[PDB]
Amino acid sequence: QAQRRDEMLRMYHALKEALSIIGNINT
Amino acid sequence: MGNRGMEDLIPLVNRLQDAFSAIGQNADLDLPQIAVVGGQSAGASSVLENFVGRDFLPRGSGIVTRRPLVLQLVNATTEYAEFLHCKGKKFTDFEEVRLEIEAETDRVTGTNKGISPVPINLRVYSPHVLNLTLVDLPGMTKVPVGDQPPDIEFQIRDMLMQFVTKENCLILAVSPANSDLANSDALKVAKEVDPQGQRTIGVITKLDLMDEGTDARDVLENKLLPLRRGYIGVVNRSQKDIDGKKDITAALAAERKFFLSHPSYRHLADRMGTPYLQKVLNQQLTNHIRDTLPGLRNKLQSQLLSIEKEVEEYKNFRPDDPARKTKALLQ
Amino acid sequence: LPGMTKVPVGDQPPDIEFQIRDMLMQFVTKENCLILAVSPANSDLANSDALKVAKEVDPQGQRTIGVITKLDLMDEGTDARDVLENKLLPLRRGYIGV
Ligand SMILES: Nc1nc2c(ncn2[C@@H]2O[C@H](COP(=O)(O)OP(=O)(O)O)[C@@H](O)[C@H]2O)c(=O)[nH]1
Ligand SMILES: [Mg+2]
């Protein structure tokens, strides 16, 4: 359960970062 | 030499690739492949190597493009070339690449006007290129010569179909100027695989060999045979110029002088020439890469919404929370 | 006869190529008829349509005579000696340049 929690949080932050990069790339 | 229209797009690909690699996933950067269809001795190899910006293909009178060479450009950190059939060797000189291509063709087809459906896979790594597929197909003919089989026409056409009926491919249709456009096979093929012109780009070569007193002014204006993207005229090196080792800079200067002096083409001077074709293809690739962004956004947005409902609780996890324990117990 | 074409223009129907061949076949498939196959010099001989038709209707070359009509417009640095000497695509009666 701890491993699943940690993976979910890492993936959440990484997805947010990906959107923050793509939006800036599109301009 | 060189191609400077890649420089403004490479960092966009790198940033998108890094953005996706952050999650352990790739980017669906499905750039179109470029296929050069043309008749024999139409000039379809000199155009291609002028787009790459390197003098590495065999070219010249006769049947030279005997096998369907496939060139893969891969973005890397240094510049080198390799062949799948020469695995383990490294090529640091394009002249060696050209000579090796000739040797590999002769080794399989022989010294007559032979062909082979099996492609050569040449890969060039360089920090100044994009991940591109370039296909140099053998030119179509009408009758067999040498030791070719009677069906040489059909075998060549079949080699073309497998590469131009594929989606996401640019058909760069090359026809000579000192001929009648109504009798160009490349355009017949394009109309058989792209009935409405969305990808097909017309290129007209050999404008310097027109019969004195005649021009193609009514062709370049897209009046004789309307094509959705028009026709781009170019002037390549002549056979004497290949044998004379003419510089690329001189060829471009001669092309620019040709268009500026020719009485029937001055008004189109800024719509033709090698660098114009480079911009048109680069703009076509840029339009493609932008068109796919809505799909990437929708995938990421869907994944984010799916996980958020559980992230809301995971972010509130604490090593000591009697309420969390109680909630789990009740549920 | 009208020349052969691949791409229709000018409101010609899509099958213009087949109609042109149908006109051609009614004169070149007759016996007791000579066929003179006209090919340009500036366009590679392997692409010649006249030789394809002559080859289809005169496999033996008894009636076909070849002519190369545009030696004036050859790209500088090349020539057609290998065609006029009947070496590249041997034809029983040879080729005549004009
Ligand atoms: N002057 C001139 N020569 C050309 C042009 N296009 C092709 N050539 C020459 O035609 C010969 C054969 O061209 P190439 O590209 O090898 O034909 P392909 O490779 O079979 O498509 C070479 O000597 C070229 O320099 C042109 O537009 N102008
Ligand atoms: Mg060619």
Side-chain angles (χ1 to χ4, degrees):
Chain A
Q1 185 64 51
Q3 293 297 309
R4 289 192 296 273
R5 183 177 65 252
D6 289 344
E7 292 298 296
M8 290 299 293
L9 292 174
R10 182 181 63 80
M11 184 177 178
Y12 177 80
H13 289 289
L15 291 173
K16 183 177 179 180
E17 291 176 354
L19 291 173
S20 294
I21 295 167
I22 292 169
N24 289 337
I25 293 169
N26 185 87
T27 70
Chain B
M1 302 295 287
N3 184 333
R4 292 163 177 76
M6 293 297 173
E7 293 298 296
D8 292 342
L9 179 54
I10 291 166
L12 293 173
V13 173
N14 288 341
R15 291 177 66 193
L16 292 173
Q17 290 170 343
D18 290 344
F20 277 86
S21 71
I23 62 170
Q25 298 180 32
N26 201 357
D28 292 317
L29 300 178
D30 188 12
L31 297 175
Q33 72 188 29
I34 301 171
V36 181
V37 176
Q40 184 178 310
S41 300
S45 295
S46 294
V47 172
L48 179 61
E49 69 183 358
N50 288 334
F51 182 77
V52 173
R54 295 290 184 273
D55 188 345
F56 67 108
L57 293 176
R59 59 172 180 276
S61 296
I63 299 173
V64 178
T65 301
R66 299 176 187 185
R67 294 182 65 187
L69 183 66
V70 179
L71 177 65
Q72 181 179 16
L73 300 177
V74 178
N75 191 273
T77 62
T78 189
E79 181 179 331
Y80 63 92
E82 63 182 359
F83 298 87
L84 291 178
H85 69 286
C86 298
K87 183 177 184 291
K89 183 175 175 65
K90 182 177 180 180
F91 293 71
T92 61
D93 185 353
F94 279 107
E95 291 297 322
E96 184 177 27
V97 172
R98 181 180 62 80
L99 292 173
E100 183 63 21
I101 292 165
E102 291 177 354
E104 175 58 19
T105 302
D106 289 344
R107 188 186 68 78
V108 177
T109 63
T111 60
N112 291 332
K113 285 77 174 175
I115 61 166
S116 177
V118 176
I120 296 169
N121 295 95
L122 168 64
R123 181 175 293 171
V124 177
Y125 291 86
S126 179
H128 296 287
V129 300
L130 301 176
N131 297 330
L132 299 173
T133 299
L134 300 175
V135 180
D136 179 14
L137 298 175
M140 293 171 279
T141 66
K142 274 69 178 179
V143 297
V145 300
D147 57 348
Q148 295 179 338
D151 60 332
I152 191 67
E153 183 177 359
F154 292 91
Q155 292 181 17
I156 295 167
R157 184 179 181 274
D158 289 344
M159 289 189 287
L160 301 176
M161 293 299 98
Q162 72 189 136
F163 296 96
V164 299
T165 63
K166 178 182 172 182
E167 184 55 90
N168 200 36
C169 181
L170 299 177
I171 301 171
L172 182 61
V174 178
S175 298
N178 59 338
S179 185
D180 186 318
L181 187 61
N183 197 32
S184 175
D185 291 288
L187 297 175
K188 179 65 176 178
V189 171
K191 290 181 182 295
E192 293 179 354
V193 299
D194 195 42
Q196 182 177 67
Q198 296 179 2
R199 294 163 289 165
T200 304
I201 300 170
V203 179
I204 305 300
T205 64
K206 298 187 176 184
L207 292 173
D208 59 309
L209 297 175
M210 297 298 291
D211 185 56
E212 184 178 359
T214 301
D215 62 30
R217 184 175 178 181
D218 58 346
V219 177
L220 294 174
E221 295 179 354
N222 200 39
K223 293 181 180 178
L224 180 60
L225 184 62
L227 179 65
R228 178 62 184 82
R229 293 181 182 274
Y231 300 84
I232 301 171
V234 299
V235 179
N236 297 313
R237 292 185 184 89
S238 68
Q239 184 65 51
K240 184 176 179 180
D241 294 308
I242 294 169
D243 292 339
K245 299 183 181 179
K246 184 177 180 180
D247 183 356
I248 193 65
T249 299
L252 292 173
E255 182 177 57
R256 186 64 174 168
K257 290 179 180 179
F258 177 79
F259 285 119
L260 293 174
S261 296
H262 191 303
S264 297
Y265 305 137
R266 291 195 293 268
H267 60 287
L268 301 176
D270 292 333
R271 294 179 65 192
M272 298 178 286
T274 300
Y276 182 78
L277 181 60
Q278 291 182 346
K279 289 180 180 179
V280 172
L281 290 172
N282 288 335
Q283 186 63 51
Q284 186 64 51
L285 291 173
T286 301
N287 291 344
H288 180 71
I289 195 168
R290 289 182 183 276
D291 289 344
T292 62
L293 291 173
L296 272 58
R297 291 195 299 271
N298 287 335
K299 289 179 181 179
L300 292 173
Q301 185 64 231
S302 180
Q303 290 177 31
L304 180 60
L305 292 173
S306 180
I307 65 172
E308 184 177 57
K309 65 182 178 282
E310 296 179 22
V311 172
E312 183 66 21
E313 294 179 354
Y314 291 130
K315 69 182 182 182
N316 292 331
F317 172 82
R318 301 292 181 272
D320 185 357
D321 183 344
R324 182 180 178 87
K325 290 177 183 289
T326 299
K327 290 187 289 186
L329 177 61
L330 186 281
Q331 292 297 335
Chain C
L1 299 176
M4 292 171 283
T5 65
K6 302 294 183 294
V7 179
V9 298
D11 294 315
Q12 291 166 350
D15 59 330
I16 192 69
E17 183 177 359
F18 292 96
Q19 292 177 16
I20 294 167
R21 288 178 63 85
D22 288 344
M23 291 188 287
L24 180 60
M25 293 299 98
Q26 305 310 308
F27 298 95
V28 300
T29 64
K30 299 295 185 182
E31 182 58 276
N32 199 28
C33 181
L34 301 177
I35 300 171
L36 178 63
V38 180
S39 299
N42 64 311
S43 175
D44 188 318
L45 186 60
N47 291 332
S48 172
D49 292 287
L51 272 298
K52 181 178 178 180
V53 173
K55 184 68 175 179
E56 290 178 354
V57 300
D58 187 21
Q60 300 299 308
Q62 291 178 305
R63 299 187 293 152
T64 303
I65 300 170
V67 60
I68 305 301
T69 61
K70 296 182 180 179
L71 293 174
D72 192 54
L73 298 175
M74 296 299 292
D75 185 56
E76 184 178 359
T78 67
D79 64 45
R81 287 180 64 187
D82 291 342
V83 175
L84 297 176
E85 296 179 355
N86 200 28
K87 295 176 185 173
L88 182 59
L89 185 60
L91 181 64
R92 184 179 182 274
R93 295 181 184 275
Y95 297 88
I96 301 170
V98 299

Short mmCIF file of all heavy atoms in Angstrom, two decimals, chain B residues 182 188 191 224-226, chain C residues 5-17:
data_model
loop_
_atom_site.label_atom_id
_atom_site.label_comp_id
_atom_site.label_asym_id
_atom_site.label_seq_id
_atom_site.Cartn_x
_atom_site.Cartn_y
_atom_site.Cartn_z
N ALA B 182 2.25 16.76 -69.45
CA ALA B 182 1.14 15.83 -69.56
C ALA B 182 1.61 14.39 -69.63
O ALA B 182 0.78 13.48 -69.49
CB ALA B 182 0.30 16.14 -70.79
N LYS B 188 1.00 10.89 -62.50
CA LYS B 188 0.01 9.83 -62.59
C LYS B 188 -0.04 9.00 -61.32
O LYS B 188 -1.12 8.62 -60.86
CB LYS B 188 0.29 8.92 -63.78
CG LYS B 188 -0.70 7.79 -63.92
CD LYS B 188 -2.09 8.29 -64.22
CE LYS B 188 -3.05 7.14 -64.45
NZ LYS B 188 -4.43 7.61 -64.71
N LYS B 191 -1.76 10.99 -58.41
CA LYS B 191 -3.21 10.96 -58.55
C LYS B 191 -3.79 9.58 -58.29
O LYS B 191 -5.00 9.47 -58.08
CB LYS B 191 -3.63 11.43 -59.93
CG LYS B 191 -3.42 12.91 -60.20
CD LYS B 191 -3.90 13.28 -61.60
CE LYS B 191 -3.68 14.74 -61.93
NZ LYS B 191 -4.48 15.66 -61.09
N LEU B 224 -1.97 24.86 -66.11
CA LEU B 224 -2.12 23.72 -67.01
C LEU B 224 -2.68 22.50 -66.27
O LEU B 224 -3.58 21.83 -66.78
CB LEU B 224 -0.78 23.39 -67.65
CG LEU B 224 -0.76 22.22 -68.62
CD1 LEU B 224 -1.71 22.46 -69.77
CD2 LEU B 224 0.64 22.01 -69.14
N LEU B 225 -2.15 22.22 -65.09
CA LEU B 225 -2.53 21.04 -64.31
C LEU B 225 -2.61 21.44 -62.84
O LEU B 225 -1.62 21.33 -62.11
CB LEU B 225 -1.55 19.90 -64.53
CG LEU B 225 -1.91 18.58 -63.84
CD1 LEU B 225 -3.22 18.03 -64.34
CD2 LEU B 225 -0.80 17.59 -64.09
N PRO B 226 -3.76 21.92 -62.39
CA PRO B 226 -3.83 22.48 -61.03
C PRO B 226 -3.39 21.46 -59.99
O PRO B 226 -3.86 20.32 -59.97
CB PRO B 226 -5.31 22.81 -60.87
CG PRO B 226 -5.81 22.99 -62.25
CD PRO B 226 -5.06 21.99 -63.07
N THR C 5 -0.33 10.06 -73.96
CA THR C 5 -0.18 10.85 -72.74
C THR C 5 -0.58 10.01 -71.54
O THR C 5 -1.31 9.03 -71.65
CB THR C 5 -1.05 12.10 -72.77
OG1 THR C 5 -2.43 11.72 -72.79
CG2 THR C 5 -0.75 12.92 -74.00
N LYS C 6 -0.11 10.43 -70.37
CA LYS C 6 -0.41 9.77 -69.10
C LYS C 6 -1.41 10.52 -68.25
O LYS C 6 -2.30 9.90 -67.66
CB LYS C 6 0.87 9.59 -68.28
CG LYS C 6 1.96 8.81 -68.96
CD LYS C 6 1.55 7.37 -69.19
CE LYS C 6 2.67 6.56 -69.80
NZ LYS C 6 3.01 7.00 -71.18
N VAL C 7 -1.33 11.84 -68.19
CA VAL C 7 -2.13 12.67 -67.30
C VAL C 7 -3.15 13.44 -68.13
O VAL C 7 -2.76 14.19 -69.02
CB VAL C 7 -1.25 13.63 -66.49
CG1 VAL C 7 -2.10 14.50 -65.60
CG2 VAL C 7 -0.23 12.87 -65.69
N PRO C 8 -4.45 13.29 -67.87
CA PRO C 8 -5.43 14.07 -68.63
C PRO C 8 -5.41 15.54 -68.23
O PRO C 8 -5.28 15.87 -67.06
CB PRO C 8 -6.76 13.42 -68.26
CG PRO C 8 -6.52 12.84 -66.93
CD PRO C 8 -5.10 12.38 -66.92
N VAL C 9 -5.52 16.42 -69.23
CA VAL C 9 -5.66 17.85 -69.00
C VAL C 9 -6.77 18.38 -69.90
O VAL C 9 -7.18 17.74 -70.87
CB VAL C 9 -4.35 18.61 -69.25
CG1 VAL C 9 -3.29 18.13 -68.29
CG2 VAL C 9 -3.88 18.42 -70.67
N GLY C 10 -7.26 19.57 -69.56
CA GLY C 10 -8.16 20.29 -70.45
C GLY C 10 -9.52 19.67 -70.66
O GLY C 10 -10.05 19.72 -71.78
N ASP C 11 -10.11 19.09 -69.62
CA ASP C 11 -11.39 18.39 -69.69
C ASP C 11 -11.31 17.10 -70.48
O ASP C 11 -12.35 16.56 -70.87
CB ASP C 11 -12.50 19.27 -70.27
CG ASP C 11 -12.83 20.45 -69.39
OD1 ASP C 11 -12.94 20.26 -68.16
OD2 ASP C 11 -12.98 21.56 -69.93
N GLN C 12 -10.12 16.60 -70.75
CA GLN C 12 -10.01 15.27 -71.31
C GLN C 12 -10.50 14.29 -70.24
O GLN C 12 -10.25 14.50 -69.05
CB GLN C 12 -8.57 14.99 -71.69
CG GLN C 12 -8.09 15.79 -72.87
CD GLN C 12 -6.59 15.75 -73.03
OE1 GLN C 12 -5.88 15.27 -72.15
NE2 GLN C 12 -6.10 16.25 -74.15
N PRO C 13 -11.16 13.21 -70.62
CA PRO C 13 -11.67 12.28 -69.62
C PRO C 13 -10.54 11.52 -68.96
O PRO C 13 -9.44 11.43 -69.52
CB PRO C 13 -12.60 11.36 -70.42
CG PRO C 13 -12.03 11.38 -71.78
CD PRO C 13 -11.51 12.77 -71.99
N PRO C 14 -10.76 10.96 -67.77
CA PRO C 14 -9.70 10.18 -67.11
C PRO C 14 -9.12 9.05 -67.94
O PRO C 14 -7.97 8.66 -67.71
CB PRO C 14 -10.41 9.62 -65.87
CG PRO C 14 -11.48 10.61 -65.59
CD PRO C 14 -11.97 11.05 -66.93
N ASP C 15 -9.87 8.51 -68.90
CA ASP C 15 -9.41 7.38 -69.71
C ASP C 15 -8.79 7.83 -71.03
O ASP C 15 -8.73 7.04 -71.97
CB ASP C 15 -10.56 6.41 -69.95
CG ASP C 15 -11.71 7.05 -70.66
OD1 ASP C 15 -11.91 8.27 -70.48
OD2 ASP C 15 -12.42 6.35 -71.41
N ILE C 16 -8.35 9.08 -71.11
CA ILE C 16 -7.77 9.58 -72.35
C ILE C 16 -6.65 8.67 -72.83
O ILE C 16 -6.49 8.44 -74.03
CB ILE C 16 -7.27 11.02 -72.16
CG1 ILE C 16 -6.93 11.67 -73.50
CG2 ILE C 16 -6.04 11.05 -71.27
CD1 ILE C 16 -8.12 11.94 -74.35
N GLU C 17 -5.87 8.11 -71.90
CA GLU C 17 -4.79 7.23 -72.31
C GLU C 17 -5.31 6.02 -73.08
O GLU C 17 -4.72 5.62 -74.08
CB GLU C 17 -3.99 6.77 -71.10
CG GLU C 17 -2.82 5.90 -71.47
CD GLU C 17 -2.00 5.52 -70.27
OE1 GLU C 17 -2.34 5.96 -69.15
OE2 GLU C 17 -1.01 4.76 -70.43
#
